[PDB]
Design an enzyme around this catalytic site. Structure first.
Site, PDB file in Angstrom:
ATOM      1  N   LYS A  78     -15.320 -10.102 -16.880  1.00 18.97           N
ATOM      2  CA  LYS A  78     -15.661  -9.011 -17.607  1.00 18.97           C
ATOM      3  C   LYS A  78     -14.183  -7.815 -18.242  1.00 18.97           C
ATOM      4  O   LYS A  78     -13.570  -7.484 -17.777  1.00 18.97           O
ATOM      5  CB  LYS A  78     -15.592  -7.961 -15.958  1.00 18.97           C
ATOM      6  N   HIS A 124     -11.740   9.388  -9.047  1.00 21.01           N
ATOM      7  CA  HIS A 124     -10.251   8.490  -8.712  1.00 21.01           C
ATOM      8  C   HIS A 124      -9.313   9.537  -9.133  1.00 21.01           C
ATOM      9  O   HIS A 124      -8.224   9.091  -8.359  1.00 21.01           O
ATOM     10  CB  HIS A 124     -10.112   7.554 -10.030  1.00 21.01           C
ATOM     11  CG  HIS A 124     -11.006   6.150  -9.961  1.00 21.01           C
ATOM     12  ND1 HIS A 124     -12.187   6.229 -11.335  1.00 21.01           N
ATOM     13  CD2 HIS A 124     -12.172   5.439  -9.870  1.00 21.01           C
ATOM     14  CE1 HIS A 124     -12.823   5.416 -11.364  1.00 21.01           C
ATOM     15  NE2 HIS A 124     -12.717   5.066 -10.457  1.00 21.01           N
ATOM     16  N   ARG A 178     -17.453   6.901  -0.974  1.00 23.77           N
ATOM     17  CA  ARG A 178     -18.539   8.241  -1.646  1.00 23.77           C
ATOM     18  C   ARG A 178     -19.228   7.713  -0.152  1.00 23.77           C
ATOM     19  O   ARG A 178     -19.708   8.989   0.154  1.00 23.77           O
ATOM     20  CB  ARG A 178     -18.434   7.960  -2.727  1.00 23.77           C
ATOM     21  CG  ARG A 178     -17.657   7.926  -3.490  1.00 23.77           C
ATOM     22  CD  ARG A 178     -17.757   8.036  -5.514  1.00 23.77           C
ATOM     23  NE  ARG A 178     -19.043   7.439  -5.538  1.00 23.77           N
ATOM     24  CZ  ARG A 178     -19.529   5.823  -5.655  1.00 23.77           C
ATOM     25  NH1 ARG A 178     -18.087   4.963  -5.299  1.00 23.77           N
ATOM     26  NH2 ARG A 178     -20.262   5.436  -6.668  1.00 23.77           N
ATOM     27  N   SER A 220     -17.554   4.674 -12.762  1.00 24.87           N
ATOM     28  CA  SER A 220     -16.895   4.441 -13.988  1.00 24.87           C
ATOM     29  C   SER A 220     -18.322   4.124 -15.077  1.00 24.87           C
ATOM     30  O   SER A 220     -18.501   4.730 -15.868  1.00 24.87           O
ATOM     31  CB  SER A 220     -16.070   4.157 -14.632  1.00 24.87           C
ATOM     32  OG  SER A 220     -14.554   4.421 -14.009  1.00 24.87           O
TER      33      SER A 220
HETATM   34  O1  LIG Z   1     -12.163   1.891 -10.812  1.00 22.81           O
HETATM   35  C1  LIG Z   1     -12.577   0.828  -9.665  1.00 22.81           C
HETATM   36  O2  LIG Z   1     -12.823   0.129 -10.439  1.00 22.81           O
HETATM   37  C2  LIG Z   1     -12.308   1.795  -8.574  1.00 22.81           C
HETATM   38  C3  LIG Z   1     -13.483   0.834  -7.051  1.00 22.81           C
HETATM   39  C4  LIG Z   1     -13.380   1.456  -6.091  1.00 22.81           C
HETATM   40  C5  LIG Z   1     -12.409   2.320  -5.376  1.00 22.81           C
HETATM   41  N1  LIG Z   1     -12.865   2.673  -4.519  1.00 22.81           N
HETATM   42  N2  LIG Z   1     -11.594   3.463  -4.658  1.00 22.81           N
HETATM   43  C6  LIG Z   1     -11.158   3.722  -6.271  1.00 22.81           C
HETATM   44 BR1  LIG Z   1     -10.163   4.943  -6.505  1.00 22.81          BR
HETATM   45  C7  LIG Z   1     -11.977   2.817  -7.121  1.00 22.81           C
HETATM   46  C8  LIG Z   1     -11.503   2.868  -7.982  1.00 22.81           C
HETATM   47  O1  LIG Z   2     -16.257   4.230 -10.470  1.00 19.22           O
HETATM   48  C1  LIG Z   2     -16.249   3.424  -8.991  1.00 19.22           C
HETATM   49  O2  LIG Z   2     -17.501   2.774  -9.855  1.00 19.22           O
HETATM   50  C2  LIG Z   2     -16.318   3.830  -7.602  1.00 19.22           C
HETATM   51  C3  LIG Z   2     -16.777   2.970  -7.132  1.00 19.22           C
HETATM   52  C4  LIG Z   2     -16.281   3.443  -5.553  1.00 19.22           C
HETATM   53  C5  LIG Z   2     -15.343   4.379  -5.451  1.00 19.22           C
HETATM   54  N1  LIG Z   2     -15.017   4.004  -3.896  1.00 19.22           N
HETATM   55  N2  LIG Z   2     -14.433   5.132  -3.962  1.00 19.22           N
HETATM   56  C6  LIG Z   2     -14.366   6.094  -6.139  1.00 19.22           C
HETATM   57 BR1  LIG Z   2     -13.044   7.471  -6.022  1.00 19.22          BR
HETATM   58  C7  LIG Z   2     -14.926   5.758  -6.197  1.00 19.22           C
HETATM   59  C8  LIG Z   2     -15.431   4.952  -7.253  1.00 19.22           C
END
Ligand SMILES: O=C(O)c1ccc2[nH]nc(Br)c2c1
Ligand SMILES: O=C(O)c1ccc2[nH]nc(Br)c2c1
Ligand SMILES: O=C(O)c1ccc2[nH]nc(Br)c2c1
Ligand SMILES: O=C(O)c1ccc2[nH]nc(Br)c2c1
Ligand SMILES: O=C(O)c1ccc2[nH]nc(Br)c2c1
Ligand SMILES: O=C(O)c1ccc2[nH]nc(Br)c2c1
Ligand SMILES: O=C(O)c1ccc2[nH]nc(Br)c2c1
Ligand SMILES: O=C(O)c1ccc2[nH]nc(Br)c2c1
Ligand SMILES: O=C(O)c1ccc2[nH]nc(Br)c2c1
Ligand SMILES: O=C(O)c1ccc2[nH]nc(Br)c2c1
Ligand SMILES: O=C(O)c1ccc2[nH]nc(Br)c2c1
Ligand SMILES: O=C(O)c1ccc2[nH]nc(Br)c2c1
Lengths: 157, 157, 154, 154, 157, 157
Positions: free
Chosen positions: F41, F17, F90, F127
């Site tokens: 949640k 993040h 990702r 996370s």
């Molecule tokens: O913390 C999350 O729930 C979450 C999920 C998906 C995410 N994509 N990019 C980011 Br920055 C991000 C953060």
């Molecule tokens: O923390 C997550 O769940 C999460 C999910 C999806 C995510 N895409 N990009 C990031 Br940085 C990211 C983080």
């Protein structure tokens, strides 16, 4: 003589679904829309409401009818003397999941599945995402038939 | 009268292709297999050889016929009074490339495309990989119609 | 002295799983099938039994239950490789994240093997669902397992 | 008596490849790197040399050139496993077809290993392209290889 | 102060590209469209023609300019005092390829890449597919700006 | 004044993040990190704890601020006079789900979405997976900011 079943929850039917219905009805002598119900989990709309919304938006398709069912889709298909399922696909991810189900259905019942590519304008629309957006007040009026949008708003309020 | 065109180079036809042909012939009143002639890429078999191999393998499909074709596929489809293409899909990337072309074909000519999912047994076979394996002595007899395999042996010596 | 762990819930084991076990057992000296304790249809004991029955012709394989971090299960048995089957690119991407995490925290490697084409569509969950509504899944499960599943449903 | 073959063009070998070699060599008694003769930058001999230089600390690995069907190369050496690295779901789907064909024609299995995160973007072709236009790829290649590549470009 | 480079062959520019340009220009103080040339392979259009077609269709975007280049994109970016690339993505497959290039570009030069999702209406359009369809006479007039369609037809004839 | 919202649950914020935050803060005049409050949640950290962990890790980003948010994201974005979202990606499936939501968000409110590609080092961290590993004694210290790791140890005893 030719025919296909178009299955789903249709909770509620979307413009993406309707596009699939129209394309199936153009290519098969008869099309049956199968509203498949899980008797253990209520959706947003009752079966009667789902069918009504579909009929109101397919009145221009004379070789299409709408029926509900539950249990194995291949049973619904074969009991009507048919052997084909038609479904829309939006992404390669939809394809991998639906591929599994299609191969299982062919294995257990000899029923074939034909997929059709989503119209580009509706690639992002799903019943679930439309319900979620509308729940928080987003404008989904262009993604749903007229038979659906205000009924959806009514359920939410 | 429902109908569809099944396009490809079929160089040579495989059991995977035949599976698609059989499934399409079961569901449409008429299927036209279109053997694409490409001036640049001259593959292993002549167009007439490819057509004869398909006819041999589809002898029990009375509503399927085989023709050669050149140029824009949607023109071929439309000039035969049809409005649908049918193709097999084996994987996710199959779907990605084909989705683009199906959307383009619907946009430029109003021709729809129906995809059938591969039989699990043939998910890995392709004309190109079978020829490549055969060239170096691999046994591809379980992947090709009986007739095709004999003709393939011939072109290799 | 090579070895690998094959993890999963195996609720129940399918012919897809068995295919992975046989292939792992052919390439590693020692294979441990790890039945993960975590809502299931079969108990851990029943799952182990079903796998044990189906792997009788595999002398270098054993079956054990497990809880907690998979990499702890692996390293506590003196190994540092996981073997898993893969059906799809989507399977791969989910498992890729896990494999890289597992390598990062514990130096445990993961080897993936491609599904046999014949079982590409079989999964424990889909087999159970179909069987529940009366469909014939006998060609997708070990003979043992199939009879045991009929019992659970009736 | 376990063993696996790691095939590729390796034109040139990268740290991504080396990572796969090291991981295979840690889990199999014998690893053969198969340099495929098939337009390249390096000759087969140069490729073999570069790989040999970079794998000095791997006692159970050897390097050989190969032509024809990979499964013939594998079986003629008494083995029946291939080990390959994978970066993406797209990688997996291409390799899946090959793996199933290879199992079908010759009973040879294929084990895939996930790329180390640090090298997920490295490929021989991209490294060569970047180096050609002056970009610094020294962190992506064995020290040996890097100097050898500079020579080919100048 | 903020700025981004939008790179491509643009041979020719499409309505999908133009959508990306407009979205980048709405969010960055300056946008440079980089027409990247391979001096070893001629495309359909010369550099001058490509630039002219882009300028004619971006006259309503005052903070956008168009320049050509060759060699490493990260060099083109850094020589202009910038550190960001903006690109459109249509599919997960586009993403995996572009991801590789983006990570390489970050590694060798510290340049960041921002991706933007294709507009649904253009998800299937590419310069290459538009050229191929037009070569065989298909109607691509709705996929290309006015500055492009008739020039394309002229090249083909 | 260019700007964007970076939305998430951030429970807790990871180095992945933070990489996104830094890249967005380098390219936009203003970045608002929106910590999403979800009544259903309830995760591991309270919203205030999540906000403080992000502020600690972003102390050197003067044009980035952190706020909590609820409900429809595009309303949050618009009420702050902004029109862009920035998110990390990702993998391919990351893109598939996010593409749908980005197209929906653009359709319903005209808000654009920019994606940045993960740094290779953090492609596998999330996370949820970090918390899961930590719970069973795995060492996730290289995947989280220094401060976060200490607070995580606390909630586990
Ligand atoms: O913390 C999350 O729930 C979450 C999920 C998906 C995410 N994509 N990019 C980011 Br920055 C991000 C953060
Ligand atoms: O923390 C997550 O769940 C999460 C999910 C999806 C995510 N895409 N990009 C990031 Br940085 C990211 C983080
Ligand atoms: O309504 C559904 O559950 C549903 C889901 C997925 C679907 N794909 N194609 C169609 Br028509 C379709 C319908
Ligand atoms: O509305 C849905 O739930 C839904 C989901 C998935 C879908 N794929 N293709 C179509 Br049309 C479709 C529709
Ligand atoms: O023979 C070909 O070139 C070819 C390619 C792709 C194909 N998809 N479906 C079928 Br039938 C098919 C045939
Ligand atoms: O033979 C091929 O190259 C080929 C390619 C792609 C294909 N998709 N579905 C089928 Br059947 C098929 C066959
Ligand atoms: O049974 C499971 O839970 C399970 C899941 C996912 C799996 N991938 N590969 C194998 Br073997 C496997 C087993
Ligand atoms: O049975 C399952 O749940 C399952 C899931 C995913 C799987 N991938 N490969 C195999 Br074998 C496999 C099995
Ligand atoms: O060097 C190559 O040609 C090559 C290609 C593809 C590859 N996948 N995995 C490995 Br190791 C590998 C090597
Ligand atoms: O170097 C290449 O060309 C190449 C390609 C694809 C690859 N997948 N995994 C690895 Br390691 C790898 C290497
Ligand atoms: O013109 C090209 O080569 C090209 C390719 C791929 C592209 N993605 N996004 C954009 Br704008 C773009 C342009
Ligand atoms: O026109 C092309 O060549 C092309 C290719 C690939 C592309 N991805 N996203 C966009 Br906009 C795009 C455009």
């Amino acid at each position: 003589m030719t025919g296909a079943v178009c299955p789903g929850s249709f909770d509620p039917v979307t413009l993406g679904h309707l596009d699939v219905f129209e394309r199936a009805a153009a290519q098969f002598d008869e099309v049956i829309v199968a509203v498949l119900i899980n008797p253990n989990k209520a959706g947003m709309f009752t079966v009667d409401e789902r069918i009504e919304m579909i009929r109101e938006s397919t009145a221009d398709l004379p070789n299409l009818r709408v029926e509900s069912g539950q249990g194995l889709l291949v049973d619904f298909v074969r009991e009507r003397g048919l052997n084909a399922i038609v479904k829309g696909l939006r992404t390669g991810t939809d394809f991998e999941y639906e591929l599994q189900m299609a191969q299982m259905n062919k294995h257990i019942a000899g029923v074939d599945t034909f997929f059709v590519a989503t119209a580009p304008a509706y690639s992002f629309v799903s019943s679930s995402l439309a319900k979620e957006v509308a729940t928080y007040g987003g404008d989904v009026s262009a993604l749903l038939p007229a038979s659906v949008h205000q009924r959806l708003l009514g359920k939410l309020r």
